[PDB]
From a paper:
Bacteriophage T7 RNA polymerase (T7 RNAP) is widely used for synthesizing RNA molecules with synthetic modifications and unnatural base pairs (UBPs) for a variety of biotechnical and therapeutic applications. A 7-(2-thienyl)-imidazo[4,5-b]pyridine (Ds) and pyrrole 2-carbaldehyde (Pa) pair, developed by Hirao group, is a representative hydrophobic UBP that relies on shape complementarity and hydrophobic interactions, but lacks hydrogen bonding between the base pairs. Our kinetic assays revealed that T7 RNAP selectively recognizes the Ds or Pa base in the templates and preferentially incorporates their cognate unnatural base nucleotide substrate (PaTP or DsTP) over natural NTPs. To understand the structural basis of UBP transcription, we solved six T7 RNAP–UBP complex structures with or without its cognate substrates (dDs, dPa apo structures, dDs–PaTP, dPa–DsTP, dDs–ATP, dPa–ATP complex structures).
For the T7 RNAP containing dDs–PaTP structure, we observed that ribose and base moieties of PaTP rotated ~180 degree while maintaining magnesium ion (metal B) and triphosphate moiety interactions. As a result of ribose moiety rotation, we found that R632 interacts with the sulfur atom of template dDs instead of the O4 atom of the ribose ring of nucleotide substrate. K631, instead of R632, interacts with both 3′ hydroxyl group and phosphate group of PaTP. Intriguingly, we also observed additional density near aldehyde group of Pa nucleobase. Given the published pre-insertion state structure on the natural scaffold had a Mg2+ ion (metal C) at the similar position and short distance between the peak of density and aldehyde group of Pa (around 2.1 Å), we modeled Mg2+ ion as putative metal C21. Nevertheless, this putative metal C could serve as a hub for a potential interaction network bridging together the incoming PaTP, gate Y639 residue, and 3′-RNA primer. We also found the PaTP is likely restrained by the specific interactions among its aldehyde group, metal ion, and RNAP residues. The pre-insertion binding site of PaTP requires larger conformational movement to the active center, which is consistent with slow kinetics and low kpol value of PaTP incorporation. Y639, which was interacting with 2’ hydroxyl group in natural base pair transcription, now interacts with the aldehyde group of PaTP via magnesium ion (and close distance to DsTP). Specifically, PaTP is the only substrate to be incorporated opposite to the dDs template.
Residue numbers in the entry: 2 to 128, 131 to 355, 372 to 756, 766 to 883
The structure:
Amino acid sequence: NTINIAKNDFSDIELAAIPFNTLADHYGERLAREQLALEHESYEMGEARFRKMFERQLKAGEVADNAAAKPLITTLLPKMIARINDWFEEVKAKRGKRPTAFQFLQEIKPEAVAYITIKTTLACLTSNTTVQAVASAIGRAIEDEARFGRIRDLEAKHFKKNVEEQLNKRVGHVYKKAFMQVVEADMLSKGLLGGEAWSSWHKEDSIHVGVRCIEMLIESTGMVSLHRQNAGVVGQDSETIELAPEYAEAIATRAGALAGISPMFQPCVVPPKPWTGITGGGYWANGRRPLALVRTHSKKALMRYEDVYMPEVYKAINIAQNTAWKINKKVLAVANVITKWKHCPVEDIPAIEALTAWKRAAAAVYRKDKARKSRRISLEFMLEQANKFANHKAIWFPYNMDWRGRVYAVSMFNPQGNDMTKGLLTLAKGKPIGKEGYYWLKIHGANCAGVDKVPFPERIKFIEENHENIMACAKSPLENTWWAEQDSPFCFLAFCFEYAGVQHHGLSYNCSLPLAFDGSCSGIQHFSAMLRDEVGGRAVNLLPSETVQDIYGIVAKKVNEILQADAINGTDNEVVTVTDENTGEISEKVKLGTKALAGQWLAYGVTRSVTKRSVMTLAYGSKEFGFRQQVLEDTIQPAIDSGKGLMFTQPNQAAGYMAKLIWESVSVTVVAAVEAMNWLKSAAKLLAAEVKDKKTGEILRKRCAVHWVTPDGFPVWQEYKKPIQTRLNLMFLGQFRDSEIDAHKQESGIAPNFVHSQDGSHLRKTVVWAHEKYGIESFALIHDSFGTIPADAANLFKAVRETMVDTYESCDVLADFYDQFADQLHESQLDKMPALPAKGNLNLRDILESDFAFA
DNA sequence: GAATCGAATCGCCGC
RNA sequence: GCGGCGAU
DNA sequence: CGATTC
Ligand SMILES: O=Cc1cccn1[C@@H]1O[C@H](COP(=O)(O)OP(=O)(O)OP(=O)(O)O)[C@@H](O)[C@H]1O
Ligand SMILES: [Mg+2]
Ligand SMILES: [Mg+2]
């Protein structure tokens, strides 16, 4: 039931003359044919991908989950619900005893029966056409939502949350229902569902409820026609159900239309098409899916950039596209061997509360089995793409941006991937390495091993002390597994081959390995530079420092100062009344004081591992509440499951105490970060407010989106939007039944999105400034990682600091942010707008002399 | 007034 | 949307 | 612990 788009639509891509000539005028006809054939293959692979998924969803009875059937379902559902309703009054107004199926259909609300019927008849017809068997299919599906939705809807709307996540962790209808069977029995043992065990429907009841549902679908919609066979013959009287061909052609056309616009983007064998406008950049042919400069969730948001003059933004994207890459054949030769022997090549190298705790161990193996299969899937695809382009002289990647302006490569195989993917990709246009390039090659090799918390001379000494090990790895990587045991193994191996090249050829050796420089904590770095935070900036190495500054260990050091103070002074333990709000029981337990809680943590030993997740999620918006879950999940629970954690008698009390100390430490260490996110959150709060006079009720000021402009000239609009109603069932997944600004997501998004737009602007300005003031042509970019060939590494090191000093010396981005929305504020809320946070004593020009900023 | 909720972006794979 | 993986 | 909304 599908139409091959490929025969005509995909043929136009190679045939059309205006795309061919514009490509051939730059790189000739031979490369033009190769590039168009590659893009043609990408669309063909994408069509094949959709069709395999469509047929697998066809075979599994999940055809309503496919995107080609959703536009159908959304116009048939309101008619079904109106007819599902309208029956109920007719039988209630018709005297006499009710039909067999009337009472069952009241146990499930009209919306849920409308979807359950449509999905199950679509499943039964596509994947026996008798009305009896399709009636029982709905009948067993209605009863499942009736019996087990009882748990969700009424008795445990608070306690469902403690089984909702573990229900979602199960995959498969059988596993999900079996878990719900255990949940229902556990609840009844506590008298939670009213003590009423379900009386399962008889098979006679299940067929009769279905034929009521099929008949009501024919009345409301024309999706399905009824057909009788051998009418009047007692033995062979049957009714066969049929999907209406006019609606089958609707999903067929939509399946073909969607199959054309889902290509598998690949690297380019010619340089990518320079961006001159909103669309059509990157790849060279026109396409069923043309590339967009900004990845927006709506076509209206992309059209906002049409006449936006942002020349520096366009130059930055086009320069990055022009960077020539090639597959690292030496690394690829190694990876082609060890992936045949291990599922993950660097995974396991040989080297020298009982119910509720071991339930988590069982869930750990279940999660690990998912993780092992997931990691292997991506590994085999990356290796296939790397081998496909291995013998090419150079390959290129097109680039675009997310709606905040961060720069992303477009192809699935691209240098922004994991350690193996980065290890398989090297720059194509190298230069003689020289003395300076060799020095930075060793620094880059030291960072791949994980020796990055020590000053530069110690990184050099680590490489020079391990000179024998590095040369042994380059000469025979399969015979010496030392490279595989490092923090970034394949990138370390890539350094090993280049290091051996300098030994075999001297400083004239042409090297093209990308040497990445990663900023410490980019979000905190930008916030500290915004408000001139001396203490906060020094913690993220903005300032020149003795050693590499480690904000994870600084917070841990501050945490341990409170722990030892709380171990001498501090509160004692106390008994306090507690009450479970569900059961209503009033009990009394021990509330551990800070003196006891500090002693437990001092026994455990609080290091940077305890604090690392909390500050890492600070820029994402986490705070003292979120830290409690992080500490419980990352530190306390792994300790208890491994025989440690004997000090933690009440883990939630230890977690909440730890979250209080981390939040006190982080909010005192990086002050300007905390103040800046608070100010932006308050800004979005007043913008997303629908202010109104309560007496009149009239809307005085409409809720407003948040809009600002980066120093590079890239504009960004934040308008999180929410749907008005959505329905989710238990065994079968959710489905839609206009949009308004989601004010909650506006508050939760504004601070991370603002700082991410700033680091995108900084990256783009770095790429431009490095390309024009110096002569750098090759760029490796992952959002805050700046890499180039070793001979240009020192200049990139200088350029990335010069741009960051330049913007914040010239732009008050928070004050510029204020100048945008201040006209949109209402009279009643300007008094409640907090003032801009005060700037500090940090001198921005010290960033130029900072060794470990890297950015 | 309480009653409830809530506590970054992007891409791939699966349902 | 949910499950898992990866990138910052 | 605040905002948002019953
Ligand atoms: O971006 C987030 C991200 C995505 C994937 C992995 N990560 C984290 O990136 C860290 C490495 O950078 P750091 O933050 O400096 O950690 P570290 O312990 O101090 O240094 P290291 O020993 O790993 O070399 C890792 O640990 C991860 O949590
Ligand atoms: Mg690290
Ligand atoms: Mg990160």
